[PDB]
Amino acid sequence: FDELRIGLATADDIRQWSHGEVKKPETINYRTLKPEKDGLFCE
């Protein structure tokens, strides 16, 4: 801990942070109560 540089985050930076991407509004299955695929809470 020496300095907290802050600034504009370019699109390349956001892609770099991302380990993947999201494609659906799905959150969980109503029955299995488990995360869906390629959506929010996507494991």
Binding site: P25, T27, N29, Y30, R31
Partner: protein, 301 residues
């Protein structure tokens, strides 16, 4: 560009020419004319360049007529979206979805039917709106057949409330829907909505209701350190036993590695036979089960 963008959308609709029977039937004639034009253009056979450009112009005019019908009937979708508003999806979003349904109906309409476009369209518009309401309204995504099951049982239960003037007993609901009470309770519990954490609970200082409830993933330091002391005492007690005995029991119960080894599985690295290792494992069971190396471990359970 104003607040409440729906008002801006209605202004964007503006004043556009409503179509009388002759107008839209002629427009649809031009639509199918452009359709045939683009069909001819798409054919790999060589067409004269001027004829191809003429066909492209006819197709473009057809596209313009499509747009005219779209804009004229934008007013129709806005009314239909109002017909379904107030059910967890935003009004202009419903209007957009109804516009998609209109695009579908328009793409699937002609004057071959002896009726107005609007009567035919109302079906597609309601189709698209109900589909989106079933697929995107709830926080938890409910399948379409489940959506119709829940709303059917809900409306018929409301009808029972209006008729009997009393809360229908669950068996009555089950026979009405014809399914078992088990399905009734299943779908009923599946037919709820979440409560948001960021809600005022009591005073403003209490603030979000999120604070009140504890989690489960948190490692309780008490239990963790209890497990650590159990680990240390257990390792010491094993060390009390002979080296080979402790090793074989540890492999039988994975005290060094998360997966315990089966008896034969221990009889490869050590070079012992599966029954030899079984025998000495039993003797370790005998040696540990004495009252000697049991007082300490009894309190750890």
């Amino acid at each position: 560009a104003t607040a409440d963008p729906v008002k801006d959308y209605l202004k964007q609709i503006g004043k556009v020419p409503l179509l009388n029977a002759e107008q839209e039937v002629e427009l649809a004639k031009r639509i199918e004319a452009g359709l045939f034009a683009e069909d001819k253009l798409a054919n790999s056979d060589k067409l004269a360049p001027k004829l191809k450009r003429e066909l492209e112009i006819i197709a473009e005019d057809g596209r313009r007529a499509k747009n005219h019908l779209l804009e004229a009937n934008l007013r129709l979708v806005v009314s239909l979206a109002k017909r379904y508003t107030g059910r967890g999806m935003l009004f202009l979003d419903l209007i957009q979805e109804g516009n998609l349904g209109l695009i579908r109906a328009v793409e699937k309409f002609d004057y071959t039917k002896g009726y107005k476009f609007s009567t035919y369209a109302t079906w597609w518009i309601r189709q698209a709106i109900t589909r989106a309401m079933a697929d995107q309204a709830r926080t938890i995504r409910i399948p379409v057949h489940m959506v119709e099951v829940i709303n059917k049982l809900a409306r018929v239960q409301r009808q029972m409330l209006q008729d009997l003037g009393r809360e229908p007993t669950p068996e009555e609901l089950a026979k009405e829907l014809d399914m078992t009470p088990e399905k009734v309770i299943e779908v009923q519990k599946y037919g709820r909505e979440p409560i948001s954490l960021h809600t005022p609970l009591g005073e403003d200082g209490d603030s979000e209701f999120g604070d009140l409830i504890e989690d489960s993933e948190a490692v309780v330091p008490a239990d963790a350190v209890s497990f650590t002391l159990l680990q240390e005492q257990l390792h010491s007690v094993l060390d009390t036993l002979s080296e080979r005995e402790a090793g074989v029991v540890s492999m039988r119960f994975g005290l060094t590695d998360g997966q315990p080894k089966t008896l034969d599985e221990i009889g490869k690295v050590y070079g012992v036979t599966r029954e030899r290792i079984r025998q000495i494992e039993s003797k370790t069971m005998s040696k540990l089960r004495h009252p000697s190396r049991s007082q300490v471990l009894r309190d750890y359970l």
